[PDB]
Design an enzyme around this catalytic site. Structure first.
Site, PDB file in Angstrom:
ATOM      1  N   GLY A 186       0.824  -1.214   0.000  1.00 20.90           N
ATOM      2  CA  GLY A 186       0.000   0.000   0.000  1.00 20.90           C
ATOM      3  C   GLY A 186       0.853   1.257   0.000  1.00 20.90           C
ATOM      4  N   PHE A 215       1.251   3.917   1.429  1.00 26.00           N
ATOM      5  CA  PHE A 215       1.814   4.424   2.689  1.00 26.00           C
ATOM      6  C   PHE A 215       3.131   3.697   3.026  1.00 26.00           C
ATOM      7  CE2 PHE A 215       2.074   4.359   7.400  1.00 26.00           C
ATOM      8  CZ  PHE A 215       2.089   5.724   7.660  1.00 26.00           C
ATOM      9  N   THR A 224       4.619  -0.811   3.883  1.00 25.23           N
ATOM     10  CA  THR A 224       4.566  -2.248   3.606  1.00 25.23           C
ATOM     11  C   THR A 224       4.721  -3.041   4.902  1.00 25.23           C
ATOM     12  OG1 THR A 224       6.008  -1.582   1.753  1.00 25.23           O
ATOM     13  CG2 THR A 224       5.266  -3.882   1.816  1.00 25.23           C
ATOM     14  N   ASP A 271     -10.040   5.422  13.013  1.00 20.72           N
ATOM     15  CA  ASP A 271     -10.263   4.455  11.934  1.00 20.72           C
ATOM     16  C   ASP A 271     -10.494   3.047  12.479  1.00 20.72           C
ATOM     17  OD1 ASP A 271     -10.512   3.289   9.427  1.00 20.72           O
ATOM     18  OD2 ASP A 271      -8.404   3.469   8.889  1.00 20.72           O
TER      19      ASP A 271
END
Ligand SMILES: N#Cc1c(Oc2ccc(F)c(NC(=O)Nc3cccc(C(F)(F)F)c3)c2)ccc2nc(NC(=O)C3CC3)sc12
Ligand SMILES: N#Cc1c(Oc2ccc(F)c(NC(=O)Nc3cccc(C(F)(F)F)c3)c2)ccc2nc(NC(=O)C3CC3)sc12
Lengths: 255, 258
Positions: free
Chosen positions: B19, B21, B23, B129
């Protein structure tokens, strides 16, 4: 900072008193274990012994170490850790006499070695590794702590003798672990056929007495006995450090 | 304290999720560990900062129901190390492999999720989140709240969707995400399953036209639990209960069934 403001901790039932203070099951954001001095006024030597236990525990963050959560100054000196569930290894092996499969006995050994490897890396000598200081949390994760409620069977000869002020070493921990491996593979305490304490001390000290390794269960691997003997060597710097122990196990583990 | 890990200690193994952002890898550092790395060479000011913020948060947590932070590493690449969870994420259980937990077990999972959240809020930490994927059911027994992301719309509270301030986030905003997780637990599904358009979901939830369908809960889901859900899912921040109250409600509920 890891102080816990006064008023938030609820102390529950008493579990016992060690050398330091008294352990209670408490409640602080869920079930927690609280070790606290039950004194009005602590002497500066106790004030210090507290700071060292806390200084040590705050340095740990690993699945196989008792999870330290925080401390309290007022009203009492107090250390909060996680509340474990199940029972110690000592209890399992010699009290309720659990009959573990070898696959698990080995896995326990591995996790213990894991936590010890971690402490030693952080420059922490445990000074009292024994089955009673090992909790089998939820009956599957090992958690090393101080659970004493003194303990010579796990002492190396050089510790027994006590030539130095300080005889403790990474190696002295290794021997203790070697006795814990004895307990695992025999299901028994060592020197069970000797009823005198001072003799056990004298002899182990003088290298006349050593654990009877024939007593291990037969499905116990030949690598595992070989490893057991290496940790139990009467000469300190012939005993391996934990990186090598952990490797030795992992090897046989995947076979 | 100093939680930096020395160089050449960690063995990054098999990849677990990519991703933009960073890993995450399974690795070896004093047994099995998870290793979130940043997969560039030269980190920007914004990346370095965000890394110090994640460490800054994580090192302030020590609780069974929170993913265990173990250490960080800057040289060579920036990396964060946590305990390795054996098991599956709660999302994975409910939505991918569809595990059917008995009701007492579902309630327990909620009790723990709440337990850890209470912790975080009492330490002035807002998750921002929370969702089924960010909850791991370690060793099929203990819950571990983390952050496995590299927005997630079904869990956002109306006021969060309407982007009122810059910070619409609140202890209540988190409590709404929790309510959506409870819905996942008691139905085994994601909300708004009969809608395939994401803008419409946003628009509607934002405007108050869409609430999760509480008729779908398992038949044996207790009434008290069903109430608690609707309490947590209230459209108005202020009417949502905080976690002390939630936990308490669950714990009274718990003792009235084996
Ligand atoms: N007794 C106890 C106990 C316990 O002892 C403590 C408590 C607090 C401490 F600070 C400590 N402190 C330490 O462990 N300190 C310490 C000191 C030096 C080195 C280390 C380390 F980390 F190296 F092991 C730890 C210990 C913690 C949890 C626990 N759970 C129990 N469960 C049960 O009895 C039954 C299943 C229901 S008993 C129990
Ligand atoms: N993916 C992943 C993953 C994981 O994610 C990470 C890793 C490192 C981090 F720093 C982080 N970072 C954080 O957790 N950060 C963070 C940020 C804000 C708030 C919080 C907190 F603690 F409040 F939740 C955590 C996360 C950690 C453990 C883990 N274990 C897995 N095992 C399996 O999948 C096997 C099938 C059995 S996967 C996995």
């Amino acid at each position: 900072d890891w102080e816990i403001p006064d008023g938030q901790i609820t102390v529950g039932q008493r579990i016992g008193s060690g050398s330091f203070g008294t352990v209670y099951k408490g409640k602080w954001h869920g079930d927690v274990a609280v070790k606290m001095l039950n004194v009005t006024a602590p002497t500066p030597q106790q004030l210090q012994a507290f700071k060292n236990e806390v200084g040590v525990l705050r340095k740990t963050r690993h699945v196989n170490i008792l999870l330290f959560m925080g401390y309290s100054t007022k009203p009492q000196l107090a250390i909060v850790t996680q509340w474990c569930e199940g029972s110690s290894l000592y209890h399992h092996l010699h009290i309720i006499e659990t009959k573990f499969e070898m696959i698990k006995l080995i896995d326990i050994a591995r996790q213990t070695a894991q936590g010890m490897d971690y402490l030693h890396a952080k420059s922490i000598i445990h000074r009292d590794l024994k089955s009673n200081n090992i909790f089998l949390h939820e009956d599957l994760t090992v958690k090393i702590g101080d659970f004493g409620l003194g303990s010579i069977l796990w002492m190396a000869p050089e510790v027994i003798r006590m030539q130095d002020k300080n005889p403790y070493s990474f190696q002295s921990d290794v021997y203790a672990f070697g006795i814990v491996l004895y307990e695992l593979m025999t299901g028994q305490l060592p020197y069970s056929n000797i009823n005198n304490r001072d003799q056990i001390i004298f002899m182990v000290g003088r290298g006349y007495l050593s654990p009877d390794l024939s007593k291990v269960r037969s499905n116990c691997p030949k690598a595992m006995k070989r490893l057991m003997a290496e940790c139990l060597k009467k000469k300190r710097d012939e005993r391996p450090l934990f990186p090598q122990i952990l490797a030795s196990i992992e090897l046989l583990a995947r076979s």
